[PDB]
Amino acid sequence: YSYTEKKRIRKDFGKRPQVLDVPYLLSIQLDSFQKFIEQDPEGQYGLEAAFRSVFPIQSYSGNSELQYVSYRLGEPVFDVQECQIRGVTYSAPLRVKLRLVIYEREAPEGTVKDIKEQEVYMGEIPLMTDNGTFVINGTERVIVSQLHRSPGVFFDSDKGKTHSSGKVLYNARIIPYRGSWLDFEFDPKDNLFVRIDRRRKLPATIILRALNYTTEQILDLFFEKVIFEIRDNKLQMELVPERLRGETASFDIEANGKVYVEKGRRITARHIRQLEKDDVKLIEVPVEYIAGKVVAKDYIDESTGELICAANMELSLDLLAKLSQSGHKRIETLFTNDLDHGPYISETLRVDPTNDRLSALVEIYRMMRPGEPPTREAAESLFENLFFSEDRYDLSAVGRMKFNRSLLREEIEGSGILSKDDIIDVMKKLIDIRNGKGEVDDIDHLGNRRIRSVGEMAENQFRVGLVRVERAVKERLSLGDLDTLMPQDMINAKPISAAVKEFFGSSQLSQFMDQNNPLSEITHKRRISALGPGGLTRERAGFEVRDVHPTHYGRVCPIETPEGPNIGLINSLSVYAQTNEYGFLETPYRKVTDGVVTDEIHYLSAIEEGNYVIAQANSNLDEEGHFVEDLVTCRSKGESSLFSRDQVDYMDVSTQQVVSVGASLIPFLEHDDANRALMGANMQRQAVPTLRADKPLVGTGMERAVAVDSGVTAVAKRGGVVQYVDASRIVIKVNEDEMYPGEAGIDIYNLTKYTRSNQNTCINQMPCVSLGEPVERGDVLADGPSTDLGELALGQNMRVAFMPWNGYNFEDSILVSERVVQEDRFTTIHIQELACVSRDTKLGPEEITADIPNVGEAALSKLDESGIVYIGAEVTGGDILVGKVTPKGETQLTPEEKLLRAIFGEKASDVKDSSLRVPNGVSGTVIDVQVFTRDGVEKDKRALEIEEMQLKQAKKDLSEELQILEAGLFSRIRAVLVAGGVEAEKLDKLPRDRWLELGLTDEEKQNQLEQLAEQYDELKHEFEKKLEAKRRKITQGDDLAPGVLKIVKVYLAVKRRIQPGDKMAGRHGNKGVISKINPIEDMPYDENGTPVDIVLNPLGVPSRMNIGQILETHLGMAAKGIGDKINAMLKQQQEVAKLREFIQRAYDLGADVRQKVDLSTFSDEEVMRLAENLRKGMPIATPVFDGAKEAEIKELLKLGDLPTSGQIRLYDGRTGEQFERPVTVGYMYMLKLNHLVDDKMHARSTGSYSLVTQQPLGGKAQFGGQRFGEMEVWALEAYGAAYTLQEMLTVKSDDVNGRTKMYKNIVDGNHQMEPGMPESFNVLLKEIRSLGINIELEDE
């Protein structure tokens, strides 16, 4: 077992033993970027390879070359945490050694001077956190792995809809990793066409001519030969018996004094066998048989010296008699069949406008760049630069591989550019497909689908940077002088900087990590997308690619995918899934040799898995693991059916290996329909953390692996005892077996405290260990938000009853008692970050000064001398968090205000109040205040206060570290001295610092003493720097935007319990909205008088089929039962015996479940604590498909003295009388979505408007009016409410006079409207009349 597994244990039902445990869930994200940035000895993908691609860069013929030596990543400017505060990017400097060589003109190549410039900084690049996240501006962000069509050759069909004929079509497409696409396609006339990209269509052969192929050669490529012999007189023919197949005899087939075939007699296998064994190498044919046959090569008269017939031309009884008299004996003709071997290329030539290489190149250049005059150098350079350029083209490794593999080649690796043989082979294959041999692959198949990740894309971006800078290098090297410049003046910063900064900054893939929740983060980091650059779009792709493919098994989750605009264009990574070496997806399997199912794991990709017969995770094997039944359910090639006892090569690794980490957290999933299951696994990521993280009452067993593998918790790096435990920090003393010889050391984990998340929720760690407690290597030291003892708790369980309660639960709406809002269990904490901008206008600078025109003493009280709110001061909507004032000259009043100001003696201030007020309606406590001052502007009072405070706090925080670490080290030295030098009492007497001056007998112990000291001083000096830098980074003015003099960031912590209108659901996809909060008095109770927490609606259950939501209720009930029993025995303090007995009983449950429980545990100090944590309930694990069973749940119920029915009599808290029939009651885990009404509720009367078109628009976060759409208009039309409509689209919105002229009448008590004309139509009048169109309003 383990350590923190002593504090609690989940009861694990199910039979199937885990053959392979769950790996690191964050695997992909980390591994990828781990490959991107790294020093790679070779051209394997990485910054190295990216460099080696475009480099070296030489001037155009100028013999001045710039090559690349090596690169390095300097230490980050700010650490992960500091950078999260300041708001900069967590990034490392890119320092690269470049070399500029100037070749002495007139080769041999040797250089006059090569200046090797030291590392030149181009840009900084983002870094990945241990949690697989990036921080762009003070915010954790994630780059979603992309899934797209892998580079290579692709043979499609496109039948049906095309041309309505039904003759179908066949198209091939060569798609590289970069560069133009090469398409080959047929048409109804069987003419082979080719196009680059999506461009103009061209007859296929025209590419071959550009490759230097004459007609003769093309015909030599795509057609066999039929040899004719004019021997004696009157032509004969060579014959291979297989040729005659698929045809009926055109004449008398006879030779060798024996007539094999007659006319009108089709040639079957019989005639073929006869002619075959008889060995007929020659047959005489009529002079008329060549009337249709097409000549292969050219032909000329030796005498006349004229062209008799061009290559690829139909022979006639005329031309034949023309070339036969010339002496020609042999004539070559294409071997053509309209069934077996199709004459497509021959007919392609007849559509070919071109003749030679040049003409082809011209017709191509006038295709790619149509309309501009074609040139030789142009048409050459283009065609060479398209598919043959090492620069502008590549398939990469995946591309070359899939290419050769789909061409049935041998070599899995080769060049990134096409070869003549490549293109020609692809054409040959397309032809073969049209001929009836060979199949067509499909895009949806996961074997044709690749998966990128952060690293690849980052590499692509940095690459684009390198090319856009390459142009600059070659540009400057044009006119450059000798030693005057260096590889600095050329290479800029921005080209790399903004290039990578763009990607991480704005991309549909790059996005703010969704952090409300551990499962949210972890399921965001494992996510795939067919969208973004390189992929398709929502409107682009249809349902096909969206749909779950059979290949998605063990790779993609069939359930958890977003439901909406993009469905199936995202999905999620399966639990055990891995990115293939090439970047396909591969899944764990169990190799079955002979008749035994072996526990040896194997990784098969989408293509690898294809022919193999795979058994099922749900199957029965006993002892040595032989399949019980002689017939076992298995899926083999694309399909699934019953297979013979031993026909199988493989079996499923686990029960959960089909689903995803999110879908694996749904208990009794096998009992839920896939729709509502999707809804559930989608909503579970929307769970907001709670104030008291509880625990799942009904589990799976992934709840540990999730919270653990995610960064929310803090795991121990090494095992040992805890020296110190604080809500702030945790200090572990490292065990000797683990700990390194030098420096000794004790692991110090600094815990994260209350701080803002990306979702404006609260993220706060808490210590789960006590002072001086033993820990295991890799154990949970401190939990996170919504995490309990290593297990993931996304919400809180509670007492649930199914019964209609006076309609208050009517729809999916939920009715909850007051016991829940009282205990503050469902309460959540929110952290809002508000900012105040001090800018500069031509009218004057803005002041943050506390001196504000027109404010009360109650407003001025909450602020200090500097105008900043005190830390810890609780505020509500309208309070002044930060004072601000902006200069406004010449108030420019009217006589009424002139008289008013004259009488009341009020000087109109030259300044307007710009202060940042608390958003209306929200109320919280100020936790933290930050001040960013422009470099060079004098720091204000509060600024200095904050600065010095941070200085002292940093001094204490670093000093404490130095102290703990040093005491720990000296202790280790003192430990070494007593071995070989021993004086125990006599040692610690003299000053500690003196201990260093001591020696010891000759031994390795004298060396360790050297080490301890050698490292001591390191930590001694490493203090200085760690202080100095830390000091300076507090002092330096943070860089700001143009015009902003300083910025005050205030952090507010609001606490919201729960109220009607909030949305909360279960993991089964049953939504709900709290309707009323009912008194405990009116709450239905049982015979024990215990009120029920929540009353749901039983009507929602049958229609939306999730029966799991009931099972979770039943089991949970029984589960809590086992809690109460223990809670009794603990309250009655029986003994360590009875408790052990009952606990052992509960951990067994009938027969045949893998458990492995106690009596190893210490009889008192251990067991008694386990029961102590179990008194709240008995946590139960129900694996996805391996989960619990009816009778098991019922038996556990019997163990809890609860009924089998799971239904207990209830009583109305009002009349007290019984409810007829029982009601299902129990415990259901309920989350709380972040959809709380406090955010959702909006309203407006008359707000600010828009400048362009006068329309309602929120300026102050005072929400602009609701949108009235065309349909919403049709409603009013149908009703026939005319004035409602008019005012709706005129006076309440678009009418610039109407709005105010209305408002006046509104206050005056007169309800009317003087509508006028909406500004939209007026604007349209001006817009139309701006053109040559005269549009007027007429009549009267």
Partner 1 sequence: ETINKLNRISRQMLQEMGREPTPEELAERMLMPEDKIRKVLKIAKEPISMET
- Which residues are near partner 1 by CB under 8 A? 93, 120-122, 488-489, 491-493, 935-936, 1039, 1042-1043, 1252
Q: Which of 1124, 1202, 1117 is nearest to 801 (CA)?
A: 1117
Strands 57-58 and 64-73: antiparallel
Report the chain's C-alpha Rg in angstroms: 40
Rounded (10°) CA dihedral 637, 642, 648, 651 = 80
Residue 935 CB, nearest distance to partner 1 (Å)? 6
Choice between 95 and 717, CB closer to partner 1: 95
- Least distance to partner 1 from the beta carbon of 1250, Å? 12
Cβ atoms of 1057 and 827 closer than 8 Å: yes
Residues of the chain by 3-state class (helix, strand, coil), percent to 5: 30, 20, 50
Question: 126 vs 767, which CB is nearer to partner 1?
Answer: 126
3-state secondary structure of 1029: helix
Is the CB of residue 895 less than 8 Å from the CB of residue 946?
no
Rounded Cα–Cα distance for residues 1208 and 1221 (Å) = 9
Phi first, then psi: give them for residue 924, nearest 5 degrees: -160, -170
List of E strands, 527-662: 528-529, 578-579, 585-593, 596-605, 621-622, 626-627, 631-635, 640-644, 650-652
Helix (H) / strand (E) containing 277: helix 269-278
Closest alpha carbon to 861 in 847, 875, 848: 875
Distance separating alpha carbons of residues 1285 and 1277, to the nearest angstrom: 8
C-beta closer to partner 1: residue 491 or 1117? 491
In DSSP notation, 832-879 reads EEEEEEE-EETTEE-B--S--SS--HHHHHTB-TTSBBPTT-EE-TT-
Three-class secondary structure of residue 698 per DSSP: strand
- The C-alpha atoms of residue 561 and residue 572 are separated, in whole angstroms, by 6
Q: Is the peptide bond before 1203 cis (omega within 30 degrees of 0)?
A: no
Q: How far is the CB of 122 from partner 1 (least distance, A)?
A: 7
Q: Rounded to an integer, what distance in angstroms lies between the CA atom of residue 342 and that of residue 335?
A: 9
> Where would I find the H helices in 407-493?
420-435, 454-476
Who contacts 223 (Cβ-Cβ below 8 Å, separation ≥6)? 296, 334, 335, 336, 341, 343, 345, 346
Taking the CA atoms of residue 564, residue 568, residue 573 and residue 578 in that order, the dihedral angle to the nearest 10 degrees is: -160
Report which DSSP code applies to 408: T
Rounded to a whole number of angstroms, the minimum distance from the CB of residue 55 to partner 1 is 18
N-terminal to C-terminal alpha carbon distance within the chain? 93
CB of 1042 to partner 1, least distance (A): 6
Residue 47 three-state SS: helix
Both structure tokens of 679: 């809804």
Residue type, 1192: E
Strands (E), 1271-1334: none
How many Å apart are CA 1295 and CA 575, to the nearest integer? Answer: 58
| 153 and 173 Cβ atoms separated by less than 8 Å | yes
Q: Which two tokens stand for residue 1067?
A: 């993991």
d(CA 683, CA 795): 12
User: Tokens 């090596």 sit at which residue?
Assistant: 70
Least separation in angstroms between residue 491's CB and partner 1 is 8
**What is the closest distance, in whole angstroms, from the C-beta atom of residue 93 to partner 1 in the complex?**
8
The residue (of 905 and 936) whose beta carbon lies closer to partner 1 is 936
Cα diameter, the chain: 138
The answer to whether 771 and 731 have CB atoms below 8 angstroms apart is no
Q: How far is CA 1269 from the centre of its chain?
A: 35
DSSP 3-state assignment of 258?
strand
